[PDB]
Design an enzyme around this catalytic site. Structure first.
Site, mmCIF file in Angstrom:
data_model
loop_
_atom_site.group_PDB
_atom_site.id
_atom_site.type_symbol
_atom_site.label_atom_id
_atom_site.label_comp_id
_atom_site.label_asym_id
_atom_site.label_seq_id
_atom_site.Cartn_x
_atom_site.Cartn_y
_atom_site.Cartn_z
ATOM 1 N N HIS A 8 61.452 36.736 76.215
ATOM 2 C CA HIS A 8 60.877 35.552 76.833
ATOM 3 C C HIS A 8 61.849 34.854 77.780
ATOM 4 O O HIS A 8 61.431 34.038 78.611
ATOM 5 C CB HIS A 8 60.470 34.579 75.717
ATOM 6 N N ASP A 36 60.136 40.836 71.007
ATOM 7 C CA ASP A 36 60.748 39.799 71.839
ATOM 8 C C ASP A 36 62.265 39.961 71.913
ATOM 9 O O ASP A 36 63.011 39.082 71.457
ATOM 10 C CB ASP A 36 60.320 38.402 71.352
ATOM 11 N N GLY A 51 65.100 25.985 74.069
ATOM 12 C CA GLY A 51 66.469 26.241 74.483
ATOM 13 C C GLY A 51 67.213 27.128 73.506
ATOM 14 O O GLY A 51 68.278 27.660 73.842
ATOM 15 N N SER A 110 65.792 29.911 72.011
ATOM 16 C CA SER A 110 65.323 31.305 72.070
ATOM 17 C C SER A 110 66.435 32.257 72.396
ATOM 18 O O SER A 110 67.266 31.972 73.266
ATOM 19 C CB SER A 110 64.240 31.448 73.121
ATOM 20 N N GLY A 111 66.434 33.388 71.716
ATOM 21 C CA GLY A 111 67.421 34.419 71.973
ATOM 22 C C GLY A 111 68.717 34.293 71.215
ATOM 23 O O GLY A 111 69.514 35.245 71.181
HETATM 24 C C1 LIG Z 1 64.665 19.429 81.349
HETATM 25 O O1 LIG Z 1 63.712 20.022 80.446
HETATM 26 C C2 LIG Z 1 63.678 21.394 80.097
HETATM 27 C C3 LIG Z 1 64.724 22.230 80.504
HETATM 28 C C4 LIG Z 1 64.691 23.590 80.153
HETATM 29 C C5 LIG Z 1 63.632 24.126 79.418
HETATM 30 C C6 LIG Z 1 63.650 25.610 79.037
HETATM 31 C C7 LIG Z 1 64.462 25.783 77.735
HETATM 32 N N1 LIG Z 1 64.355 27.156 77.228
HETATM 33 C C8 LIG Z 1 63.335 27.583 76.508
HETATM 34 O O2 LIG Z 1 62.403 26.827 76.164
HETATM 35 C C9 LIG Z 1 63.358 29.043 76.126
HETATM 36 C C10 LIG Z 1 62.876 29.943 77.293
HETATM 37 C C11 LIG Z 1 62.161 31.104 76.603
HETATM 38 C C12 LIG Z 1 61.451 30.387 75.431
HETATM 39 N N2 LIG Z 1 62.406 29.341 75.076
HETATM 40 C C13 LIG Z 1 62.641 28.875 73.814
HETATM 41 O O3 LIG Z 1 63.673 28.250 73.540
HETATM 42 N N3 LIG Z 1 61.715 29.163 72.881
HETATM 43 C C14 LIG Z 1 61.882 28.833 71.478
HETATM 44 C C15 LIG Z 1 60.992 27.684 70.967
HETATM 45 C C16 LIG Z 1 60.281 26.878 71.866
HETATM 46 C C17 LIG Z 1 59.466 25.826 71.383
HETATM 47 C C18 LIG Z 1 59.337 25.605 70.011
HETATM 48 C C19 LIG Z 1 60.018 26.435 69.094
HETATM 49 C C20 LIG Z 1 59.929 26.163 67.717
HETATM 50 C C21 LIG Z 1 60.611 26.961 66.803
HETATM 51 C C22 LIG Z 1 61.446 27.987 67.249
HETATM 52 C C23 LIG Z 1 61.550 28.244 68.621
HETATM 53 C C24 LIG Z 1 60.864 27.478 69.580
HETATM 54 C C25 LIG Z 1 62.589 23.291 79.005
HETATM 55 C C26 LIG Z 1 62.608 21.920 79.348
#
Ligand SMILES: COc1ccc(CCNC(=O)[C@@H]2CCCN2C(=O)NCc2cccc3ccccc23)cc1
Length: 218
Positions: A41, A83, A168, A170-171
């Protein structure tokens, strides 16, 4: 990470961050001097990889450009299966006490095992708050059959606790008994609800793919 605490300094030398420029995108782990393992992802056209510090933006950290990346072929954007992704660094990571190769698993740790998940993802939800210091939380492995939201994924959480991963994260790594057992994949939004465990890719099921993908892209 929700309801965690700063990781002990220097205890995650195999942790990396994948940045879009200087913005956090995902966590990951260093497999060897040329490869990072993360979630599918997290795909981007290119990455800047942070290594060697628990603090994002630390002037002592290593930053390395990575142009190429390779997803596991079965990745589903809908179901989150498969993933995982390998990111090829453009230049070798310089190894030291602060930059170490992760210990990949030889066996699958069972449900009920206590593990630690780490990342620089948001500490709040739905409001985002991104910590500069790497955060850690201890969670227990949950079988996918016991995880309502879900054979190669795991869940992890603490009964009646908010402890979890979030945006943030993920991975990034879920480690148990000194080995990498999971990579953060997904969960409910907003984050941090009790009895709502996060989902992880079960690393022990992808031994062959990780080794072979690196060998096929030398
Ligand atoms: C300035 O605002 C901002 C700045 C940067 C970003 C992108 C920041 N990265 C991402 O969200 C990554 C990208 C791929 C999926 N992601 C996860 O962390 N998913 C993991 C994930 C997401 C949501 C809920 C979850 C609950 C439990 C476990 C994992 C979860 C967003 C808003």
């Amino acid at each position: 990470i929700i309801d965690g605490a700063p990781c002990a300094r220097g205890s995650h030398p195999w942790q990396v961050a994948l940045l879009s420029g200087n913005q956090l995108h995902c966590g990951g782990v260093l497999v060897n001097e040329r490869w990072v393992l993360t979630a599918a992802h997290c795909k981007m056209n290119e990455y800047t990889v942070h290594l060697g510090s628990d603090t994002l933006g630390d002037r002592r950290a290593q930053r390395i450009k990575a142009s190429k990346s390779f997803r596991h072929p079965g990745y589903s954007t809908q179901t989150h299966v498969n993933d995982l992704m390998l990111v090829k660094l453009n230049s070798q990571a310089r190894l030291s006490s602060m930059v170490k190769k992760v210990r990949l698993p030889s066996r699958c740790e069972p449900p009920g095992t206590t593990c630690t998940v780490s990342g620089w993802g948001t500490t709040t939800s739905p409001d985002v708050t991104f910590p500069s210091d790497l955060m850690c939380v201890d969670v227990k492995l949950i079988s996918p059959q016991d995880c309502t939201k879900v054979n190669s994924m795991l869940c992890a959480g603490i009964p009646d606790s908010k402890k979890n991963a979030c945006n943030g994260d993920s991975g990034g790594p879920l480690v148990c008994r000194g080995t990498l057992q999971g990579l953060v994949s997904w969960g409910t939004f907003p984050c941090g609800q009790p009895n709502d465990p996060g989902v992880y890719t079960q690393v022990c099921k992808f031994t062959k793919w990780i080794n072979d993908t690196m060998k096929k892209h030398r």
